[PDB]
From a paper:
In the best characterized pathway, importin (IMP) α bridges cargoes bearing basic, classical nuclear localization signals (cNLSs) to IMPβ1, which mediates transport through the nuclear pore complex. IMPα recognizes three types of cNLSs via two binding sites: the major binding site accommodates monopartite cNLSs, the minor binding site recognizes atypical cNLSs, while bipartite cNLSs simultaneously interact with both major and minor sites. We combined bioinformatic, biochemical, functional, and structural approaches to study this phenomenon, using polyomaviruses (PyVs) large tumor antigens (LTAs) as a model. We addressed this possibility by x‐ray crystallography, and solved the structures of putative bipartite cNLS peptides of MWPyV, STLPyV, WUPyV, KIPyV, and MCPyV LTAs bound to IMPα2ΔIBB.
However, its sequence (274‐PFSRKRK‐280) does not match the monopartite cNLS consensus (K‐K/R‐X‐K/R), therefore it could represent an atypical NLS interacting with the IMPα major binding site in a non‐canonical fashion. Our results strikingly revealed that when incubated with IMPα2ΔIBB, MCPyV LTA NLSm could be visualized exclusively within the IMPα2ΔIBB minor binding site. Minor structural differences toward the N‐terminus of the peptide included electron density for residue S276 and loss of the K277 hydrogen bond with IMPα2ΔIBB S406. It is likely that a stronger affinity between IMPα2ΔIBB and the bipartite MCPyV LTA NLS meant that this peptide was ejected out of the major site in the bipartite crystal structure. However, in the absence of NLSct, NLSm is still functional and can directly bind the IMPα minor site with micromolar affinity. Therefore, while full‐length MCPyV LTA can be imported to the nucleus in high levels and via multiple IMPα isoforms using a bipartite cNLS, truncated LTA fragments can still interact with the IMPα minor binding site through NLSm and be actively transported into the nucleus.
Residue numbers in the entry:
A (entry chain C): 7 to 13
B (entry chain B): 276 to 281
C (entry chain A): 72 to 496
The structure:
Amino acid sequence: ARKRVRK
Amino acid sequence: SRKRKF
Amino acid sequence: GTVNWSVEDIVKGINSNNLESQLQATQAARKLLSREKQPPIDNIIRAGLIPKFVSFLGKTDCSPIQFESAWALTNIASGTSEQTKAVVDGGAIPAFISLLASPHAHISEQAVWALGNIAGDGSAFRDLVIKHGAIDPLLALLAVPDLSTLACGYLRNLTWTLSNLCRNKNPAPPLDAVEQILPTLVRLLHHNDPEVLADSCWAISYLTDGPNERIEMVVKKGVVPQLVKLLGATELPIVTPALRAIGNIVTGTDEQTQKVIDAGALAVFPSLLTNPKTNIQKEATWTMSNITAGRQDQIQQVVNHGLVPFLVGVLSKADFKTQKEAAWAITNYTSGGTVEQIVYLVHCGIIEPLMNLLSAKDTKIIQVILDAISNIFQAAEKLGETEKLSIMIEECGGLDKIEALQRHENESVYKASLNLIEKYF
């Protein structure tokens, strides 16, 4: 994964 | 020579 | 509360001259940007909130607004390259780097995450994050006697951000940055957390994908034995990057390939060449093809480990891409191998699947297969058994395939097929 969203 | 990179 | 705010209410709160109202509005924005479905990133950008979030990043006297703005900007930087670019244009990189040293662990973690997203956008933003001086504080965060004293999520985030700093090419990361990062990355490669291990292996795989000098940089740190250990792991998320790194390394010089072989990697390839995951099989066969392109003693190590029957197997039945990698491996084997080794290859049953694959609709595989046939025939000539091999190729229906190939569209293909039919049939 190149970018990850924080949820 | 015969090596193939990714 | 702070859930389901309108972008207009968030704007009104952030535009107030009240740091606490600004904090509540920023928290509402964070919650909007943490939605699982269609986070309104573009609407938040169009409202011009990124500069305000970046300014909030510097409010040391209000750590909650620091954390909330860092979270919002992280989620904005997680989307399209245009959105990450909007985050970078607001001056976020130096603010996040300054935040890395925050006394609050969660804020420093959020800064690490944001920098990871920005760097993962691409090589330009990666090198810009490096130029702003992120590596020194990032590594200082991991300067502990035992990594096990750090929070699991903290360590995973740091490892992933470092991996992104090792990622992408055109250009590859600056050599000095790689030298600065490698020691810590090796320490992480010896950590006992599967996610840390997987991301560290991914980083190593990035660093080994390029010119042989990069491979040497990595190999000099002695990571090959650990890479082989991880290659034997049970978790696919670990085996995949470990196999990628091993393959990359065996793309290099004969001595780097030999370092891979000395670590015992070949003993793992019986499983890898039969792995139920198609990608694992494909990359393992690609690795085997690069190993059979090595020296004759290395081909002999392939033989001794009983791997030729496994190449015969993947050539007989596998995904077509894996079969093409296997054909490449066979051609390299026959090009570099001794006469005895090619005879052994024939004795393991290569001719029938090799011939069956000549009916493929891919020119390149046909070429490769024909070069392999020519090499095996040369060995036969040396042993004076060309007619035996011709009979073996006829009985399995290969002569029909070559005669049909004589009328192929490509020029090299029909040239080679005709040459075989004229020299041996």
